[PDB]
Amino acid sequence: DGNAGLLAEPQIAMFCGRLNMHMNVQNGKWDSDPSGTKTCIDTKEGILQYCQEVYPELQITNVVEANQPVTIQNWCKRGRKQCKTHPHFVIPYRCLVGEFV
Ligand SMILES: [Cu+2]
């Protein structure tokens, strides 16, 4: 079973020119890049590394594209500032937790 007390699954969302977003599993909201500097990544390995960076304690071992597109409002385009605009939608990547054997 999963944790009902956590509104969402770990995921990252990218849109080149803007800061990467990730899902806050506690509240179900998209949070901006923790360092406030990282934008889109073009390799699967780079995405996995990023999942591991923003979810350091989740033991993320793989990533896969999500099935549904998602809209994110007022996306952060730099710093952790300058982020009030029209909606954009992207297909997120799910950060998958492996079961270690
Ligand atoms: Cu736009």
UniProtKB/Swiss-Prot annotation:
Binding site for heparin: 74-88
Taxonomic placement: Eukaryota, Metazoa, Chordata, Craniata, Vertebrata
UniProt-annotated stretches for the region GFLD subdomain: 6-101
Species for this entry: Homo sapiens (Human)
Disulfide bonds: C16-C40, C51-C95, C76-C83
Official protein name in the record: N-APP
Protein origin, superkingdom: Eukaryota
